[PDB]
Amino acid sequence: ERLAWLRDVWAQIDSDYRSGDSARQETAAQEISAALRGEPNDHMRWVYETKRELRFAGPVGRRAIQEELQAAELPEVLDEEVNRYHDLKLNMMEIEREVKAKYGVAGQQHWAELQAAK
Amino acid sequence: ASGKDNTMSDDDVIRNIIKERWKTLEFGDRNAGYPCTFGDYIQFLNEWFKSLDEEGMQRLREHFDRRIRPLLAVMSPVDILWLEALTQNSPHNKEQLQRKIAFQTSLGTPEFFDMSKRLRYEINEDYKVRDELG
Amino acid sequence: YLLNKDDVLTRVLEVVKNFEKVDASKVTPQSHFVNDLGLNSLDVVEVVFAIEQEFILDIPDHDAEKIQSITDAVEYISQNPMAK
Amino acid sequence: CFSSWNDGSEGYEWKSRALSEKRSLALEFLGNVNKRVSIHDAIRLKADINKKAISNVSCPSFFSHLSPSDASLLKEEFLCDYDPSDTKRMAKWVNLRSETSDYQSYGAIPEGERSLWSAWYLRNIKAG
Amino acid sequence: GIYELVVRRGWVMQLPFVNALLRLTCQATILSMERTPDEAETIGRFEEQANKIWNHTFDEWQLQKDVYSYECYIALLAHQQRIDEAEKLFQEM
Amino acid sequence: LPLIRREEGEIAGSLWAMDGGELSYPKDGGGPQGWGVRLWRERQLVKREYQKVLDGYRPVPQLSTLGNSVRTAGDQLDIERSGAQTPGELSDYRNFPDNRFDGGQLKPESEAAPAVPFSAELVWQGEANDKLSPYKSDEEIALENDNTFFSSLRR
Amino acid sequence: SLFDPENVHRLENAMTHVKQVFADYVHKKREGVSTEAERRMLANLTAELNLETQKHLANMFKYAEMRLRQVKLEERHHQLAEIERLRRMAQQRGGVKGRKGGSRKMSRMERLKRVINRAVGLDIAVAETVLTEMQAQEEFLQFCEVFARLTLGSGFKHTGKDENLSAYIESLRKLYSMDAATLSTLDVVQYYSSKEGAHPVDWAKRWYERALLLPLQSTPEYQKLLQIQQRDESVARIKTQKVVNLVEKMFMDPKDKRLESLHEKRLRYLAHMQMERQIRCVRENAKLFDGVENMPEAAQCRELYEKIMEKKTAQCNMTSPPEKIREITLRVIRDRHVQSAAATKARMLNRIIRSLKGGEQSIAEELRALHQQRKEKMTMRILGIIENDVKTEMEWLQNMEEAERPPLLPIPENMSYVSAADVQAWRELREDDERKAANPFERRRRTFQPELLGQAWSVPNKPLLFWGTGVSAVQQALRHVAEDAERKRQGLLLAPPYPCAENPWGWRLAKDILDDN
């Protein structure tokens, strides 16, 4: 089932790559390159986050999100897969790099304070 | 601000005051602004227990089973020691515990504590089976 | 305005019977504290003040002086109209 | 100013204030035992007092053939008096409860990463 | 819906198909009896569907009831504890 | 309750007591068989069940007084102003501010109708949500949807 | 620009910063320390964000998919409303044509309207109908709110007792099934979705009717105006050559039997939208004018209360016969006219502006002004969203900070004392309580079951005295002071107050000052 679904997804991708439109071909090229380099998609990350939010949401919120997304045709994700995504820890080097890049000197000052706390 | 809830709850506004009064109880010096000290509370507990027959002790243990076992099971030993510090209400030992890093971090698990009501409900439904369906 | 006589008679007799110093079954509708029930002069004051706490009205010292048994308190409280 | 919008250590004065606000809020949420208390009506009364004070506080308002684009702009302002969809659409940009949601959502912070030396509040930082 | 879809196609209605419908209705009745013992209204609804099939559909499509048909109907009666009728059906078969 | 009972022992000790005997409580001598260890192991079992809740096998528990007693010291007020029986209910209270009553009360489910996208009117959505399409033949579905040369045509 | 889907990091950068400045403004405002510098910085940030929003307004339409969907929906709804107005105008032109076939002046007016529709891209008749409906709704809600305010003293209280959404959808269903007698859910949703802009009032009218216990459908001229407004607004080769739109064919026919649930859900959603709009428009009116209508004009409010009492006596009389009024209601209408004179801040001036635009001839300047207006309103919306976010975050954070305060001090009361009269009055309840305690089936179905840790308090059968109690303690105290004086003259000491091996817990008698020495 998942292979058929992402086969349709890459049908979209292939149609973009063959469209001729420069922007569409560009996007198809970067996504093909990311897939070949093996970096996992952000759509899947959003899918996992939304599935956990639906799991932990109240009834009216569940109905709202469920009716919003019911036509989107998102893949069937097992609770096990969502929990596997969520459980694995988050790295510290990427966080420090991102904060120092988004805030610069403030980022270095904050990280120095955090390490001093350590 | 509403007032209508109080109006309809006039038959049971007393329980609201009782809950708030139970909350607002603290231990200190009688001659000070506090109502009673930890020593007086402990003496009252000791003698209240001594004043119980076997039936009274059985009913007290039933109350323990129904009420404290859930909360006590869910709560961590650090949480129990923190509550002991609160009961003693001694600023110096409370300050020492606040200084201790391990005591600060591991207390805040209310989502985990929420299992306590399910545990209480199961124990109470078993006691209810016994005492009402018997 | 005025309570009937029997109610306060019952109130005072049970209130005095509930005193720790006194002994039950020695209380009759007519009895003297020091002589019959055996209480020192230093206790009749808190006796009249048990009657006070039952009848929140405040009784003056001069009138309390006139009360030395249970009957006298009975007439005083019964004839008081400001009582409840 | 216009340059204070960009990443790379520009706007430091308020960068630092917001960044340290997040740290202080997390430290208060985790390591403050005196903060874990049940309300005793002295919270209930003045919480509504502060609610009404904030509601009374007033936000300072500022001074405030045709082409198909012009026709669409006129039609949108003419036929539409109050759109309910755009209000929730603005949510994806304003991030309602941007700073409180991380702590008042359910199951967000895992138990393992719940120390003061941890950097859990930065997980959502994404540079340009 | 499958049944009416078939009669719309105009196919030749088959004894296995009618038996499948009868089995569906009888199993629904049995299973409702055992799981939701209340709602005798729904119990009788399922039972009426099963009886209507058994009593009219076979002669409507001119089919002869067979081993499987009697198997399903006797299963229904046995679950209903209608011993006399079920045993009568057995020895008549 | 059965899970905790099976492992280390009865939790409702004194549930079947008579005359003060037949008690199943831990020994008063703090040790490997005492209150600390017994409560630690009960804590482990409830922690296992809470991990199940987090993984989603089990339903989320309702809000408890013990849990309510912490609630950031500010979320208690929100819970009190709302019905707030479950954390999902509290989440809805916060995330749908237009659904509330006046005064802060929570409005029940039967009057919150989310918008339904027009994308559900697609032919493949109709086929997926219809329970007889798999048994309907290609010609039947073709005439059901389109009766024109576009769909006229094996197949 | 900033709002395009490539500067989202800068835009969150914007939320953080504007939130901080607005939080400072709120703090300094609620502390009565309003900062001119803070207000100026907020104005500068608002101007910068306003320039960004003006830049993004053109780019956002081309980039955002939701903006394109909204534009297409608006265009389709305008086309449908114009088609309905064109059917109405066709009926009107058929009626007038019988009156006069040579309608030269009306034809010239229609030609001018068509020229406007070509250049302006709008229907004057549709705009006028929408404006009239909106003005009638606004006037009706104002009148109803002031009437209820003065009659009962209460404004708008949206409580669970109100009309539910299921009842509302049922009411609309019956309304249309009686209007047409053949309207199914699909047709009902079709009509309501086509309209999508007619301001309903029926729910608010029902609530006000239930609040005032008087009919409102005939007496008020504004209700009559709204009702009349809604009443008056109420071959083969060619097809082969017509290209088949595959995107159309990708959708199944709307009159399909598999769409009933979808249509019912759409009806529910549209009814919820209508009810929420009604509640919203009543709510801002209540917060705007009801805060002053109740307190201000005390004499007029008292006169309205007297009129209400008169109408209440009249209603009691009417119920007596149902088991004068019109004059009283007209008096109350004349009274609320007084507030209407005080009523200001009309919201129908947008149509005045648009009428100016209609007669505009410097069209470029007017469209620039309209673009400025749109940019200003949308940046005001953005600022309002940010204000709500900052308000709620500040309230939450201050509530979090509020925890560590001390509790209130209870006020002292009379000593707990169960009167002798009280005790003797209801021993009968005591006997019944004992009898109920006897049998098992009704032990816990007893009145007055307090509890300490385990034990359940009964009803006391003796008065709880104070003054006579405490003789044993004082006697033992006399003995204790005798032995303690012996101790003092002998030079002895009690158990070691500090925690020792013999006394692990440090057990120490509380040294009182009166007894210290």
CA angle in degrees (0–180, nearest 5) for G5-G11-G15: 145
By C-alpha distance, which of G381, G356, G376, G379 is closest to G366?
G356
Number of inter-chain CB pairs under 8 A, D vs F: 32
F20: its two tokens: 């003060």
Query: Cβ F101–G160 below 8 Å, yes or no?
Result: yes
Q: Give, rounded to a whole angstrom, the gap between the first and last alpha carbons of chain D.
A: 18
For testing contact with chain E, the best of F133, F136, F141 (most E CBs within 10 A): F136
Distance CA F99, CA G275 (A): 11
* DSSP per-residue codes, G90-158: HHHHHHHHHH-S--HHHHHHHHHHHHHHHHH-S-HHHHHHHHHHHHHHHHHHHHHHHHHHHHHS-----
CA distance B28 to G393: 36
Q: Which residues in G lie closer than 8 A to residue D128 (C-beta atoms)?
A: 9-10
G405 secondary structure, DSSP code = S
Gaps in chain G (C to N distance exceeding 2.5 A) after: 234, 323
CA C78/CA C61 separation, integer angstroms: 18
Alpha carbons B126 and F5: distance in angstroms, whole number: 13
List beta partners, residue F122.
Answer: G251
Strand partners, F27: F34
Distance from the F107 Cα atom to the nearest Cα atom in chain E, whole angstroms = 33
Beta bridge partners of B36: B27
User: Are G331 and D55 within 8 A, CB to CB?
Assistant: no
Q: Give the nearest chain B residue to D116 (CA atoms).
A: B105
Give the sign of the dihedral formed by CA C9, CA C11, CA C12, CA C14. Answer: positive
Neighbours of chain B (3+ CB pairs under 8 A): D, F, G
The closest of D112, A115, D39, D116 to B104, measured between CA atoms, is D116
Chain A interface mutation, best of F50, F52, F53, F54, highest count of A Cβ atoms under 10 Å: F54
CA angle D72, D77, D79 (to 5 degrees): 90
- Under a CB-based contact definition with an 8 Å cutoff, are residues C47 and C39 in contact? yes
Residues ≥6 apart with Cβ < 8 Å to G96? G103, G106
| Cα radius of gyration (chain E) | 14
Q: What is the CA radius of gyration of chain D?
A: 22
State how far residue B53 is from chain D, nearest Cα, in angstroms: 35
Half-sphere exposure of F117 (CA within 13 A, CB side): 17
Q: How far is B76 from chain G (nearest CA, A)?
A: 23
Q: How far is A49 from chain D (nearest CA, A)?
A: 11
> Distance between CA G122 and CA D65 in Å, rounded?
12
Whether G509 contacts chain B with CB within 8 A: no
Angle value at C-alpha G282, between G281 and G284, nearest 5 degrees: 70
Query: What is the C-alpha separation between C40 and C46, in angstroms, rounded?
Result: 11
H-only helix segments in B9-114: 13-23, 38-50, 54-63, 69-74, 77-88, 91-99, 101-105, 110-113
Which pair of structure tokens corresponds to residue G311? 């109408």
Q: Helix, strand, or coil here: C31?
A: coil
Rg (CA), chain B: 19
Breaks in chain D (C to N over 2.5 Å), named by the residue before each, are 64
> What torsion do the CA atoms of B117, B121, B123, B125 make, to the nearest 10 degrees?
180
Residues 6+ apart with CB under 8 A from G31: none
Dig out the tokens for B33 from the structure. 């602004």
Verify whether the Cβ–Cβ distance G15 to D100 is below 8 Å.
no
- Cα diameter, chain E: 41
What are the structure tokens assigned to G454, written together? 């385990």
Q: What is the resolution of this structure in A?
A: 3.3
Quick check: G9 and D7 CB within 8 A?
yes
Q: Do chains E and B touch (3 or more CB pairs under 8 A)?
A: no
CB atoms within 10 A of CB G439: 9
Residue G56 near residue G4 (C-beta atoms within 8 A) = yes
Three-state SS letters, G344-403 = CCCCCHHHHHHHHHHCCCCHHHHHHHHHHHHHHHHHHHHHHHHHHHHHHHHHHHHHHHHH
F92 contacts A61 by C-beta, under 8 angstroms: yes
What residues of chain F lie within 8 A of the CB of E9, using their CB? 137
Helix segments in G180-259, DSSP class H: 185-195, 202-212, 221-233, 236-241, 246-249
F73 and D97 in contact by Cβ < 8 A?
Answer: no
Residue G19 to chain B, least CA–CA distance (Å):
28
3-state secondary structure of D117: coil
Which of F69, F74, F91 is closest, CB to CB, to D106?
A: F91
CB atoms within 10 A of CB C57: 12
Do chain G and B touch: 3 or more Cβ pairs under 8 angstroms?
yes
Which tokens in the block code for residue G251?
Answer: 């959708």
Query: Do the Cβ atoms of A106 and D19 come closer than 8 Å?
Result: yes
Contacts of B63 in chain G (CB under 8 A): 451, 453-454
Chain B residue with CA closest to D49: the answer is B1
With beta carbons under 8 A apart, name residues in chain F contacting A58.
Answer: 86-92
Grouping H, G, I as helix, E, B as strand and the rest as coil, residue F18 is: strand
User: CA of G352: how far to CAs of E53, G119, G123, G133, G199, in Å?
Assistant: 73, 20, 16, 15, 20
Question: Each residue of A72-81: b (16+ CB within 10 Å) or e?
Answer: eeeeebeeeb
CA dist G420 and C13 (Å) reads 10
Of G216, G208, G220, give the one whose Cα is nearest residue G150.
G208
Taking the CA atoms of G217, G219, G225 and G231 in sequence, report the sign of the dihedral they define: positive
b/e map G464-473, b = 16+ CB within 10 Å: ebebbeeeee
Contacts of F135 in chain E (CB under 8 A): 1-2, 5
The CA distance from F58 to F64, in Å, is 17
| Under 8 Å between Cβ of G191 and G176 | yes
Q: State the burial class of residue G29 (Cβ atoms within 10 Å of its Cβ: 0-12, 13-18, 19+).
A: buried
- Exposure of A46 by Cβ count < 10 A (0-12 exposed, 13-18 middle, 19+ buried)? exposed
Contact B23 D40 (CB under 8 A): yes
Q: Find the residue in G nearest to B60 (Cα).
A: G454
Q: CA-to-CA distance for C64 and C68, rounded, in angstroms?
A: 8
Separation CA G272–CA G270 (nearest Å): 5
Taking CA–CA distances from G508, the nearest residue in chain B reads: B39
Q: How many CB atoms lie within 10 A of CB B73?
A: 22
Under a CB-based contact definition with an 8 Å cutoff, are residues G304 and G339 in contact?
A: no
Q: Which of G196, G247, G252, G394 to mutate to test the interface with F (most CBs of F within 10 A)?
A: G252
CB G187 within 8 A of CB G193: no
Q: Which long-range contacts (CB under 8 A, 24 or more apart) does A68-77 make?
A: A68/F114, A68/F115, A68/F117, A70/F120, A71/F117, A71/F119, A71/F120, A71/F122, A71/F125, A72/F119, A73/A5, A74/A47, A74/A50, A75/A1, A75/A2, A75/A5, A75/A6, A75/A47, A76/A1, A76/A2, A77/A47, A77/A48, A77/A51
Residues in Cβ contact with F30 at an 8 Å cutoff, skipping those fewer than 6 apart? F36
Handedness of CA G365, G371, G376, G377 (dihedral sign): positive
CB contact under 8 A, D115 and B105: yes
Write the single-letter amino acid at G406.
P
How far apart (Å, rounded) are the C-alpha atoms in residues G425 and F44?
A: 55
CB atoms B107 and D38 under 8 Å = no
Using a CB-CB cut-off of 8 Å, the residues of chain G touching C56 are: 414
Q: Cβ of D36 and B20 within 8 Å?
A: no
Matching residue, tokens 């959808």:
G169
What the block records as the tokens of D66 is 């045709």
Nearest to G39 by CA among G30, G50, G52, G26: G26
Instruction: Please answer whether residues D82 and D8 qualify as being in contact, where contact means their C-beta atoms are separated by less than 8 angstroms.
Output: no
Distance CA G309, CA G303 (A): 10
Tell me if G403 and D43 make a contact (CB, 8 A cut-off).
yes
Those of residues 74-113 in D touching chain A at CB distance below 8 A are 106-107, 110, 112-113
Whether residues F14 and B2 touch (CB distance < 8 A) is answered with: no
Q: Chain G closest CA to F44's CA: distance in Å?
A: 28
In the stretch 25-44 of chain B, residues with CB closer than 8 A to chain D read: none
